[PDB]
Structures are given as C-alpha cells and as structure tokens.
Design a binder for these strands. Structure first.
Ligand SMILES: [Mg+2]
Lengths: 225, 346, 96, 48, 48, 45, 55, 55
DNA sequence: GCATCCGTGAGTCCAGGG
DNA sequence: TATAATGGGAGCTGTCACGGATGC
C-alpha cells in the first residue's frame, strides 16, 4: 500500500525521509506529496515511492513512563479528582480517593512523580558489600557485587549497541534485560525468576532482602544486637 | 512473562531470507559503504560522520545519540546541517546519498533477518557463567560485525561467515565476563587448557592427577609449582551469604571478623603509649623534646631531615644531630631508671 | 559463638524487658557502647582501664549502614534537628 | 559405545565416571573424613 | 631494637580447654601427600 | 535419584559435544555426575 | 546539633549524582594478580576512598 | 495509580510487550488517542505501513 | 457490589555447624 | 575471518490469613 510518483529530474528527498501531504518530492517541487508516509527512492524504477504511514510517537519502557510522569500536572489532576469525588457512584469516589491520596502525597511532600524512574542508579559503598580474603587467602564476597556487575555489563553493552545503530529488536531485548537487572539488584525474585549464581539454586541476596524479615537489618541488627 | 519466549516470538516475526533476498541486501550494503566513501571524497567530510548522518536519517530521531569516535557531538542540528550540505549536491553526486540510505536500510534488514542463527548457536554455550539472553546479545554483536565485513562476491552464504564472528563474540564474552575477579583472556585460555589436561589424565588414571602428572602432561615450561600457582590464581570467590546449615539461620559472612579497624584494646594501648611518651618527653628541655618530635614525625606526621629541624631552630645540621643524641641519651637514662615504657615494646 | 570468642545476643525481647523497667541508660549501653558504637566502645574501654566513667554514647554503626543501604534503594533518609535542618551523622566524611 | 548411524562405525570404551561413596559395615558413610548417615524419608506413596 | 619481619601466629589452646597431647599428624608438601593449592603443611594435634 | 540427576546433566553435555565436534571418552565429561553425588552426600538435609 | 527527626523521601537523579563520588564504568572488582582494586570498577579507591588511612 | 494504568498495562509497557503513544501525530487505526496501547504489529502498520510478499 | 481468585510474608529463645 | 549452519528448556506439589485484584 504505497503511492507512486514518477520523476523526471533530481528528487529533493532521500530514502528514509518522512513526508506529509503537501511536501516537495522531486522535479524542483513539480511532484508533491498526496498521502502521509515514508520515502523510498527507487532509482531503478525512477519513481519516488511513498509507503502510507504516520510519524507516530509511541514508545516502550521506563522512558515512555518517565515522559508521561514528567507531563503530569498535579494541581490539574487534583482538581479533576475532586470533581470526581462528587460522583453518585460509590466505586468512582473510591477510585478518585485512592488516586488523590497519591496525588496529594506528591503535592505535600515536594517529591516529583518522575523520580520513581531511575536514571542514575546509586552504588553502595564497598565496605558494606565487601570482598575479603578469609584465613587461607581465599576470597569471599557479597551477592550485591554480582548483581551490580550484571547491571554494568548490560548497560555497557547497551551503550555500545546504540553506538552501532543495532536494529530495534536488539535494542528492545537489551532494554528489557536492563530493566530486569535493575529489578534484581533492588528486589530479586519480586518479578520473575530470581537471579542465581551458576551451579546453585540459591537466589542472590538483593537490597530489599537485606532490610526485611527476622534476618533483616531492622530486627537483627537494630532492634537487638 | 518469560523473556526468552518473548524474544523468540519477536524473532519469529521477521521471515527468513531467500538466497535472492540475501544476496540483494548484502550487495546493497557493500555498495552503500562504497557510496559513503565516494561521498567523503566529494564533500571532504569524515566518512564516519557521513555514515552516522545517513544512519540517523534511516533510523529516525527516535535513536539519535553521540558517537565516541566522532569529533563533533551528533546533534539533530548538526545532522540536519550535514543532510542539507548533502542534499545540495549535483544529481550525479546526490546519487550516492540514495545509495547510502539504501545500504543502511538493507543492513538493518539483514541483521533482523538473521537473528535466529545467533539463538541456535548460543543455546549451546549455556551453563558457562552467562545467562542465555546475555549470550544471545553478545552473539548479536558478532552478527553485526559479520554483516559489516561480509563479501557477497565470494558466493558463500551469509550463515557461514556469520557463525565465525558469532562464536567469536560469544566466547569473548564468556571469557571477559564470567568471573567476578576478571582474568585476562590468554590466562583464561591457559586455565582452561589446564582443566582439559587434568580431565584427560583422570580419564586415563582412574583418579585425580597430582600437580606433577599435570606438569608432565602440560609439557616443557610447566613444573608442579607452576601448575599449583595457576590453580591458585584461578580460584573464584565464594558468597558471603552462603547458608551454614539447614535453616536460614546463619551465613558464612557471620563468622568473618573485621581485621581492619583497631580493637578497643589496641586503641587504648596506643593512647597509653602517646601519653607515656609525652610524660617522658617532658623530662627534656623544650628544644630536645621538640627536636625528637620533629625527627620522629610525632608532630606533623612526617620526620623532617636534620637540615630542616636545624633551619627551624636556627642551628647546624650537626648541632641538631648532637642535640637529638643527647635527648635520646636522657630518655634512655630515665627509662632504665623507671622502666615506664618497656612493656609497650612487645 | 564460643569459638569466635562471641558475645551474647541481646535480642528484641531482652530490649522489651529493659524498656519495661525504664532502664534507659542500661539499654542505650547495650545498643551503642557495647556493640557497634565504634568510638563509644573504644572510649569506654579506655575510661574503665583509667578508672574514669564511661563517656556518652554516639551513633551505632549499623544505623549508618541502614542509611547507606536505603540510599542504594534510591531513598534519601535525613536526620534533621528541631528546626528541620539536616544533621550529618557522617561527620563530613561522605559529603563532597 | 558410539555408533554413527550411516557409517555403521562402532567405537567402544570403558570410561571413568568418578567415585561413588561406599557404605561401611555398620551402615554409615565416610564423607571427607566425617561419618555420616543418610536418614530415610517418609512421603505420600505414588498412586491414585 | 629492630622490629622483626614476622609476627607470632601460633595455634594456642583456647579458653576453657586443655588436657594431655596424645597424637600429632604432620602433612607437609613435597613429602604420597598433596594439599589444596598454596598450603605448604597442615598440622593436627589431638588432646585428651 | 541424585545419581539420575547427575547422569541427566552428563547426557546434556554429551549431546552438546555431539553437535560441536569432528570418542566415548571425548564425549563424556564426568564432572556433573561427580558434582551431584558430592552434593547429595554433603549438603542434603 | 541534636537529631530530633528522621525524614525519608524519593531521591532525584540529581540528588543521587550529588551523593556519588564517581561513576562506576567497569564490572571489574580487584586485579587477579595484585589483589588491588581495578580502575573505574566496584572497589576503586579513586571513587570510594583509600583502603589505608591517609595514604 | 498516578497515570491510571492497570497492572497488566504497566507491565506490558515496562517490559517491552506493547507501545504507548505520547503524540499520535494524526494517526488512524478511529484515530489514535494519546496514551493508547498498540501491539508491535499494530504500531508497525501505523509507523511503517502495510505490505506483503507472495511467492 | 459483590462476591471470587490472586499474590505475599509470617511462624519463641539459645547453641553449633559436619 | 568464508561449505553450511536460522525460535529454549524446566517444571515439582500435605500452610494460612489478608489486602488488593479480577470476573459475575
Ligand atoms: Mg613438565
């Protein structure tokens, strides 16, 4: 489903370029654009083809979500949910209240919604995740170092893959993997299968595991010692 | 839910190349690279800069980042400027721009069409320290290298050439990433050769080999001590969160004492020492106490030379040496008299 | 552990007992000078072997550890004073 | 024995697989110097 | 007095233990004896 | 049962080397088997 | 001063960068021969501080 | 809760199973409303076009 | 709204560990 | 660096109350 436009001279647009009806294709503007689409200059066939498609902006991942959260106007949404609180239906008042609790928590705290998306991931000081030589010179280390190394390898491979313009499928795989690596660093096993070291079924111990439970930092080292 | 099920689906979306489509895309890639070279000859720009601008337009502004080799930050502004400098060329020159754009589009399509071959190779390198998906991605890097280096004139199929770079990239990844304490690639090769040698020897010996038998089998240059030192260098760390016993009661880390921070006993011994040294030093004159303190570093942490303490007290280096020596003589006389610093000597 | 020349656990319930007696200083010793208040434990040993009284405790190290582990979770945990101004429990050693 | 289906070639060998712990006379094991007992387990029987 | 170059890291009888020494075993490398990489000798003392 | 698990891992290694290669001994790496037995006799409940 | 309250809040990317003393760019930990920390990795003294006091 | 996304929807976006639109730039599939969830096949249609090869 | 169908975190103290 | 090679394996089992999420 494309629209053909033959030319008799130099064309002004190259393959890949995106075009709206009314755009100058070729022949000094003699051939124009009828339909929305994508330019394929066929030199063999001497025609400027235009495959019908919009320049739509639809993203995936935390980048998309981070945009939408940056765009939220909190006061506006609060006004709308207050209007919603005047509804007859009890369930719609319930939903508006639950949303407005979050809205006004961000409003009164001074936090920004988009801060729930990470750009810079913090790195714990190395003495809290040590690499120590035990008696005998052999080495022992925290699981967190392996969780961080996974994250760093996946990020660095993503930066390289972006530099070589890899096809989208490859970047999408890498980005899904980066999200899961951050997720395993922060709360391993929360979403999906837990990350384990090779040759062991034991889940690596993440930052969430360190705080929680009878063995966590709170009950084990702060409420008793 | 299952990320490799998702990725296998996404890959099953793109259909497999016929010989004709294969050759066509490879040809388009080769010719687009030649066109970038010709555009560099014409415009006097940088072939890398041109390749990046053509790529920026083929891919879209969705993916438009900076490149580490480029001397100029690749910003939409600069890619538009370069695209306009290009679009202003005569028809017979601007022909090469369409060539290059066609080449980049073919390149993307050729990679995407051969994503399945990476998976079929990488499923065989599991259990070696890298996740399946991690192997797939490193193999994908190998496949990209292959696409850029392929020559369709040779009439070899693409799969043949791509398997070599894919294996290259998977194995490189395994040897660069598998270990927590990173070991250079050549040393990993030696370690793995040592492993295979040991395994062959056990299979012929019906038990594990000694260091010496391993040394024999590794040939000249290898004695038992070198085998042992290599095995020592190869040891991977163990987890601090390793369970000790059946419950989740305790972990290996629980039993590791901090050897770095001074114990309360050591700190108090150092403090009693400082105080006893100050006490014994007050039995000297201000100058001999001060000369000793400057010369031992008890003041500013460092020990000054005789010339510096002398220039400070306005006196010869020989003079300062002589007053250091009488200060020591006095300290020793008092210490033999009272035995008040002896026990600190261990 | 006896083999590690170990200390006794003063667990959650031992703490509740001291709280219920109102034995506030005894409990503060258990939580600082006697466990993981580093300067506190050093200074208390020194004061005792000198015949002085034990000094006032300061921050236990495991609370510093908790703050750093929350910072790794992307949470900013701030000790304030009554005027809501930050107080640095790390004595400048962690601020650029 | 390794058989290639098309060639008909057959290679045969006795390969060493490692070691299996032996039970001592009294019913126990010696694993890395220390005596050990494998304790029997009770479970629901298979069936319908 | 020159500070020596080695320090005392001997095995001592722990608090609350002791008795009569009844056996010593001495496995040193370079002797049908091979230990894990880097250890030159192990000594074991039995006390009754 | 642990022996059966070790043997299954050994067989996976065998099929792996049956794909990549140009003998029974060459095809057989005993390590997984030895690992499983050891794992049974040391760290089981 | 004296601690009277303890606040907890979301940390912004900029707040996180203000905490950091360096970006960790390499997945390395310590050098396999010297057992010292590798540059730009998870144990780098350049970022996280010296291993020995005042040195 | 903030963006009025369900658990399934937020998963599908976040783990690269569905696209979400920040500007439809006048697209049509009933036209494309902002914050709409399109499968990769749908998004490919709207972004690159429809086509097919027949042997 | 009204039920059902889900995820999830929890389970006294000490000791030693093989 | 070139014959050709194109979608993976693993599960796994005798708890329970409760807050939130999906079908009616
Ligand atoms: Mg030799």
């Amino acid at each position: 489903k494309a629209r053909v436009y033959p030319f008799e001279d130099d064309v002004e647009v190259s393959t890949g370029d995106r075009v709206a009806p009314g755009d100058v294709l070729a022949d000094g503007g003699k051939v124009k654009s009828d339909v929305y689409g994508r330019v394929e200059v066929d030199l063999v066939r001497n025609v400027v083809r235009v495959v019908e498609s919009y320049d739509i902006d639809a993203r995936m991942g935390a980048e998309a979500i981070q945009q939408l959260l940056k765009e939220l106007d909190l006061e506006a949404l609060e006004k709308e949910l207050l209007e919603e609180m005047k509804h007859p239906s009890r369930a719609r008042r319930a939903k508006a209240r639950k949303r407005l609790e979050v809205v006004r928590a961000f409003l009164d705290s001074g936090n920004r919604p988009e801060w729930m998306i990470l750009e810079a991931v913090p790195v714990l000081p190395p003495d809290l995740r040590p690499m120590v030589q035990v008696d005998g010179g052999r080495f022992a280390t925290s699981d967190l170092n392996d969780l961080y190394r996974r994250l760093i390898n996946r990020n660095n491979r993503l930066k390289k893959l972006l530099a070589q313009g890899a096809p989208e499928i490859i970047i999408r795989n890498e980005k899904r993997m980066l999200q899961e690596a951050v997720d395993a660093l922060l709360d391993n096993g929360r979403r999906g299968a837990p990350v384990t070291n090779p040759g062991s079924d034991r889940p690596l111990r993440s930052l969430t595991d360190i705080l929680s439970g009878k063995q966590g930092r709170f009950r084990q080292n702060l409420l008793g010692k | 839910s299952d990320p490799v099920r998702q990725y296998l689906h996404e890959i099953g979306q793109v259909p497999l190349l016929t010989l004709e489509e294969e050759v066509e895309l490879a040809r388009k890639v080769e010719e687009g690279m030649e066109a970038i070279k010709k555009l560099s000859e014409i415009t006097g720009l940088d072939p890398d800069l041109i390749r990046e601008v053509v790529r920026a337009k083929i891919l879209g502004s969705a993916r438009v980042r900076h490149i580490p080799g480029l001397k100029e930050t690749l910003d939409p502004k600069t890619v538009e400027e370069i695209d306009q400098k290009l679009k202003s060329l005569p028809k017979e020159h601007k022909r090469y721009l369409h060539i290059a754009r066609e080449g980049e589009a073919a390149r993307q399509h050729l990679i995407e069409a051969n994503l399945r071959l990476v998976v079929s190779i990488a499923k065989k390198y599991t259990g070696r320290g890298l996740s399946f998906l991690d192997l797939i991605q490193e193999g994908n890097q190998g496949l990209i290298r292959a696409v850029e280096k392929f020559e369709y004139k040779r009439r070899f199929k693409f799969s043949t050439y791509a398997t070599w770079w894919i294996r290259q990239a998977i194995n490189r990844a395994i040897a660069d990433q598998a270990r927590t304490i990173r070991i250079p690639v050549h040393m990993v090769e030696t370690i793995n050769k040592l492993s295979r040698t040991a395994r062959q020897l056990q299979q012929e010996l019906g038990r594990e080999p000694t260091y010496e038998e391993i040394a024999e089998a590794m040939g000249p240059g290898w004695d038992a001590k070198r085998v042992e030192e290599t095995l020592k260098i190869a040891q991977e760390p163990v987890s601090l969160e390793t369970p000790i016993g059946d419950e989740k009661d305790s972990f290996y880390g629980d039993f590791i004492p901090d050897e770095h921070l001074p114990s309360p006993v050591d700190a108090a011994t150092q403090s009693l020492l400082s105080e006893e040294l100050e006490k014994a030093l007050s039995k000297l004159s201000e100058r001999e106490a001060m000369v000793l303190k400057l010369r031992k570093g008890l003041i500013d942490g460092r020990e000054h030379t005789l010339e510096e303490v002398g220039a400070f007290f306005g006196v010869t280096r020989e003079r300062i040496r002589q007053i250091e020596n009488k200060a020591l003589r006095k300290l020793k006389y008092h210490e033999s008299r009272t035995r008040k610093l002896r026990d600190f000597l261990d | 552990g006896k083999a590690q020349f170990g200390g006794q656990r003063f667990g959650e319930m031992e703490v509740w007992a001291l709280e219920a007696y109102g034995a506030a200083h005894t409990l503060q010793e258990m939580l600082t000078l006697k466990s993981d208040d580093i300067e506190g434990r050093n200074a208390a040993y020194e004061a005792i072997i000198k015949g002085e009284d034990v000094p006032e405790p300061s921050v236990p190290e495991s609370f510093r550890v908790l703050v750093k582990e929350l910072q790794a979770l992307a949470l900013d945990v701030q000790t304030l004073d009554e005027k809501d101004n930050p107080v640095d429990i790390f004595e400048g050693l962690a601020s650029k | 024995q390794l058989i290639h289906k098309d060639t008909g070639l057959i290679k045969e060998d006795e390969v060493f697989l490692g070691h299996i712990p032996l039970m001592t006379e009294d019913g126990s094991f010696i694993i890395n110097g220390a005596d050990r007992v494998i304790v029997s387990q009770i479970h629901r029987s298979p069936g319908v | 007095e020159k500070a020596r170059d080695v320090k005392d890291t001997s095995l001592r009888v722990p608090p609350g233990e002791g008795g009569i020494v009844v056996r010593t075993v001495r496995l040193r490398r370079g002797d049908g004896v091979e230990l894990k990489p880097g250890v030159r000798e192990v000594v074991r003392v039995y006390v009754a | 049962d642990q022996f059966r698990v070790g043997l299954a891992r050994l067989a996976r290694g065998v099929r792996e080397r049956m794909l990549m290669g140009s003998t029974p001994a060459k095809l057989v790496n005993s390590r997984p088997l030895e690992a499983a037995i050891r794992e049974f006799f040391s760290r089981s409940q | 001063k004296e601690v009277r309250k303890v606040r907890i809040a979301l940390a912004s990317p900029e707040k996180i960068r203000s905490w950091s003393y360096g970006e960790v760019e390499k997945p390395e930990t310590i050098n396999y021969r010297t057992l010292k920390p590798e540059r730009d990795g998870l144990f780098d003294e350049r970022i996280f501080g010296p291993i020995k006091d005042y040195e | 809760t903030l963006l009025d996304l369900s658990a399934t929807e937020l998963e599908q976006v976040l783990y690269f199973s569905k696209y979400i639109v920040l500007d439809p730039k006048g697209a049509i599939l009933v036209p494309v409303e902002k914050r709409q969830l399109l499968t990769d096949e749908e998004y490919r249609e709207l972004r690159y076009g429809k086509q097919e090869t027949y042997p």
